[PDB]
Structure 1
Amino acid sequence: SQQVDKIKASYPLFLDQDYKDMLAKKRDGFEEKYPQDKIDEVFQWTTTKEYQELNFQREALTVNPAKACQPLGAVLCALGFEKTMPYVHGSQGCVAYFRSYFNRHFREPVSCVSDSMTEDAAVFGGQQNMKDGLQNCKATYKPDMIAVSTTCMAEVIGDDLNAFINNSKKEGFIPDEFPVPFAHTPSFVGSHVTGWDNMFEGIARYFTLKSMDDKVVGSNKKINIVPGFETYLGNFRVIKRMLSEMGVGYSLLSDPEEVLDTPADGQFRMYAGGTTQEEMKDAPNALNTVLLQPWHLEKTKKFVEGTWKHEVPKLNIPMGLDWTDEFLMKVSEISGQPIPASLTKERGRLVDMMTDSHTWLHGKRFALWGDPDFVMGLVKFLLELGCEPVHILCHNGNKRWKKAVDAILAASPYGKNATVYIGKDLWHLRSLVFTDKPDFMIGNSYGKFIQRDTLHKGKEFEVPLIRIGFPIFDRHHLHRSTTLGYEGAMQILTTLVNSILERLDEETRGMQATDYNHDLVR
């Protein structure tokens, strides 16, 4: 029954008495459900420490992972160049998943193509599929470059991308001067950040391998910047603004911010902005190359230091206060341009916010997860704020990164209770926050279920989630926020302090019970 003046969606229509009775009838008649007491007892057992031991003894089962496969990052990297069509050599089903993932996160149209390989191509290879796909894509969508990636199936079969592309070139399917870089991105190696690294190295090698004769370091007086797997537009914006504000000639390779924030003015632009091909060609002429995310740009660093002959600096991700300062000082030293008064004014304002909010920020316990560099810089910033990161989780981390984070933690008195987990999934984190409760969680939308679990144990056991990372699905337009630099530090600080104060306001809203602490001024 629905009222025409007040129409109810699934919630709370299915809370009606008739729907409740029908659900109860179904459950008691045909579902053969376990008794409610048994369910409650099993749930209680899942929150105990013995369950945590059994869950940490897992060796083959992965539950609720916090990472994706390489071609997703490869497609994101391919999206950062001008009029470049991301091409995935493999079956068509996974390209749809990539597009759906990026559509749900960015809330923008994402363009990608696949050659739709089938078991007939599985038994004989995908050479003809590659030829037809290249020809059809070039004829239909008119790109100036096609970046080729591999689905895990083409990797298991063992298709040679170079041979297939060359054969397509010499048989008239595509013009011989058409740039078609390729990269091998096995989905069973690393994660999406590794795919981004593979695709970027493939494009750089395609554009700057055979032309390394008329190349002099520092000719154009520009600095190359590689952003890595970045899902915040504000990060690209802040890097560009910080570099242009102090008069430093820069060259942002693979920036997708223009194509992922196109305006809605009655027309559809499939391509917009990006890195030009001449920009990639002129890359080795730069004085130096700066990697914003070194810990997943290892192969790119190897190629840059081995072919471009660029002395890549030992720089962390520009997140926090000390690391942003170090990045600015290194760029100033490389380019010879002094840091202007505006940047130091911004730094002073950020220190002002830290000083104003240290009282509420001090001592709070956070359990955070995400990509390695983002996680490590977030831990550094939390240690700068006097915060306590107790559970640090990185599914796609390695022992080297874990040792680096341990060295970072040991240099601060607030890292005494900090433990770093690599290779562990979100079920491990659920057990961790159940057996050692922090004050808040910091991660993507996939943590929103863990919060629910805690709320079932009790209100006093709930661990609220703070949505900072990738992917954020349940909130709108959070991809436009900033994460790197002073501006990103201000945004993160504001989010943390306001989440803490909102939690306090919720906890102290009980009239005649806890409203004695319902302060107007906080």
Structure 2
Amino acid sequence: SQQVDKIKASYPLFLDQDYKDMLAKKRDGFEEKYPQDKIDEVFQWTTTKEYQELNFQREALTVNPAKACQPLGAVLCALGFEKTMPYVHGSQGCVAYFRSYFNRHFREPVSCVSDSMTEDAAVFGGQQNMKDGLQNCKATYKPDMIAVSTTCMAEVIGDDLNAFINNSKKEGFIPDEFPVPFAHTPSFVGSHVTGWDNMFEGIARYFTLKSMDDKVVGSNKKINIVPGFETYLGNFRVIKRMLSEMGVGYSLLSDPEEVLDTPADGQFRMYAGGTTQEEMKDAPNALNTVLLQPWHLEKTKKFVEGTWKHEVPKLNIPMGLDWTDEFLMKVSEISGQPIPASLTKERGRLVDMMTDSHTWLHGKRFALWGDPDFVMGLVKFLLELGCEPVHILCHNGNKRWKKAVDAILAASPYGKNATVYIGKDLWHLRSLVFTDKPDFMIGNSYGKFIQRDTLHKGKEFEVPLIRIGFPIFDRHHLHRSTTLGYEGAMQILTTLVNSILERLDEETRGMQATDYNHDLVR
């Protein structure tokens, strides 16, 4: 039933007695469900160190992965270019999912096409799909550039993207001088970040490989910035902000911040802003190229070093205090611009915040996950705050990266109880937060199911989630946030400390029981 003046949605509707009785009847009658006692027993077993040993012995089954597939990153990379249409050569189901995934994270349109390869193309190839696909897309959506990637179907059957695109130009489907960069992006190799790297390099090749004769390193007097797979608008924004403050001439290569943040003003803008083709053509004339996320930009690094002849600086992701200083000092050296008083002050306000909040942060224990660069930056900043990154999980991380993070943990007393996990997933992480319980989790929305499990064991065992990363689907507009630079450090500082203080307030809100510690001033 419903009272018209207080309509109940699913929750709390189905807590009503008649629904409760109905659902008990359904269960008892037809579900043949294990007794609750047996369910409790198995749940409790899933929280044990015994279960964890079995859990970590897994070599075939993956449960609740902390990664996505290559063409996801290729699309996001492709969106960062001016009036560019990402185009995934292969089956169409992939593109429905890619768009939907980003839709839900950014709460924006995400424009991307497929050439809809079917069963019959498997036996004979997707050449015709390419010809017609490219022609249709250019005519219908009017992009200035089409950036091509692949699904696993197309990769397994072994379609030569280069020839296919060339034959499309040869046969008049698209004009010969219409830019169509490509990249093979197999979803069974690496992860979504790998597709970003592959797509970017493919676009870098397209616009510069054949034109290197007339290029002088440093002639345009700019610095190229490659952001990598990046889902916070504030991060693109802060880098540009800090470089402009320094009076540093720059070129951000792959900038989707405009397309992923168009105004709702009565018209849909398919394309907006982005890195121009002219910027990519001129890029080799830069002083140098800086990779903001070097651990998934290996291929791009080799091309930039090998072809453009830029001596790419060895810089960590600009996250936290030390690595932002390093970033700014390196930029200063390359550009010959001094770090302005404004950025010096901002650094000091970050340090001021760190001294104000250090007592609540000190020794606090975290389980965290995400992509390699994001995770090591968070780990580094956590150490700088005097926090202990107890469980560091990176499903798409490698042996060399793990080495780099273990070294960072080694350089701090706050890394003594920390373990770095590569190749593991959030079901592994579930075990760790039961058996070696931290104070909080820092991760994406899939973590909400881990907090739910911990609460079920008991309130004293509940490990609250702190939502930083990708994807965040169950909160609104967190994609506008910043995690890079002093600004980003400040935002993380604030989230971390206030997460701790909200938790304390909950635990001390009991009248006459625990509210003796329910301080007005903290």
Q: TM-score range by the shorter chain?
A: over 0.9
Q: Deviations over 1:261-303 (max 9, x none)?
A: 0000000110000000000000000000000000000000000
Per-residue deviation, 1:346: 0.2
Per-residue deviation, 1:51: 0.2
Give SS of 1:85's match. Answer: strand
Give SS of 2:211's match. Answer: coil
Per-residue deviation, 1:188: 0.4
Per-residue deviation, 1:229: 0.3
Q: Deviations over 1:163-216 (max 9, x none)?
A: 100100011100011010010000000000000000000000010011011000
Quote the residue 1:322 is aligned against: 322
Quote the residue 1:453 is aligned against: 453
Quick one: distance in 2 between partners of 1:370 and 1:187? 18
Quick one: distance in 2 between partners of 1:26 and 1:314? 62
Give SS of 2:479's match. Answer: coil
Q: Deviations over 1:340-385 (max 9, x none)?
A: 1000000110000000000000010000000000000000000000
Per-residue deviation, 1:499: 0.3
Quick one: distance in 1 between partners of 2:448 and 2:399? 28
Per-residue deviation, 1:511: 0.3
Q: Deviations over 1:101-122 (max 9, x none)?
A: 0000000000000000000111
Q: Deviations over 1:422-449 (max 9, x none)?
A: 0000010000001000000000000000
Per-residue deviation, 1:456: 0.3
Per-residue deviation, 1:95: 0.3
Q: Deviations over 1:372-420 (max 9, x none)?
A: 0000000000000000010000000000000000000000011000000
Give SS of 1:351's match. Answer: helix
Q: Deviations over 1:65-108 (max 9, x none)?
A: 00000000000000000000000000001100000000000000
Q: Deviations over 1:37-84 (max 9, x none)?
A: 000001011111100000000010000000000000000000000000
Q: Deviations over 1:476-505 (max 9, x none)?
A: 000000010000000000000000000000
Quick one: distance in 1 between partners of 2:45 and 2:236? 46
Give SS of 2:159's match. Answer: coil
Kindly report which structure 2 residues correspond to 1:43-58, keeping only aligned pairs within 5 A, or say none.
43-58=43-58
Alignment of 1:276 with 2:276, yes or no, is yes
Give SS of 1:474's match. Answer: coil
Quote the residue 1:170 is aligned against: 170
Quick one: distance in 2 between partners of 1:293 and 1:33? 49
Give SS of 2:168's match. Answer: helix
Per-residue deviation, 1:130: 0.6
Quick one: distance in 2 between partners of 1:461 and 1:269? 47
Quick one: distance in 2 between partners of 1:50 and 1:166? 58
Quick one: distance in 2 between partners of 1:32 and 1:167? 60
Kindly report which structure 2 residues correspond to 1:61-460, keeping only aligned pairs within 5 A, or say none.
61-460=61-460
Q: Deviations over 1:128-183 (max 9, x none)?
A: 11101000001101111000000011000000001100100011100011010010
Per-residue deviation, 1:457: 0.3
Quote the residue 2:14 is aligned against: 14
Task: Extract unaligned runs of 5+ from structure 1.
Answer: none
Provide the TM-score with structure 1 as the length reference: 1.00
Give SS of 2:267's match. Answer: coil
Q: Deviations over 1:203-250 (max 9, x none)?
A: 000100110110001101100000000000000110000000010000
Give SS of 2:392's match. Answer: strand
Give SS of 1:366's match. Answer: strand
Per-residue deviation, 1:328: 0.3
Quick one: distance in 2 between partners of 1:27 and 1:3? 28
Structure 1 segments of 4+ aligned residues over 3 angstroms from their partners:
none
Quick one: distance in 1 between partners of 2:33 and 2:277? 62
Quick one: distance in 2 between partners of 1:13 and 1:417? 46
Per-residue deviation, 1:466: 0.2
Quick one: distance in 2 between partners of 1:13 and 1:142? 48
Quick one: distance in 2 between partners of 1:12 and 1:142? 48
Per-residue deviation, 1:464: 0.2
Give SS of 1:202's match. Answer: helix
Give SS of 2:367's match. Answer: strand
Quick one: distance in 1 between partners of 2:457 and 2:143? 54
Quick one: distance in 2 between partners of 1:190 and 1:60? 16
Quick one: distance in 2 between partners of 1:154 and 1:28? 48
Quick one: distance in 2 between partners of 1:463 and 1:496? 14
Quick one: distance in 2 between partners of 1:31 and 1:340? 68
- The count of residues paired between Structure 1 and Structure 2 equals 522
Quick one: distance in 1 between partners of 2:176 and 2:340? 48
Quick one: distance in 1 between partners of 2:172 and 2:305? 36
Give SS of 1:66's match. Answer: coil
Provide the TM-score with structure 2 as the length reference: 1.00
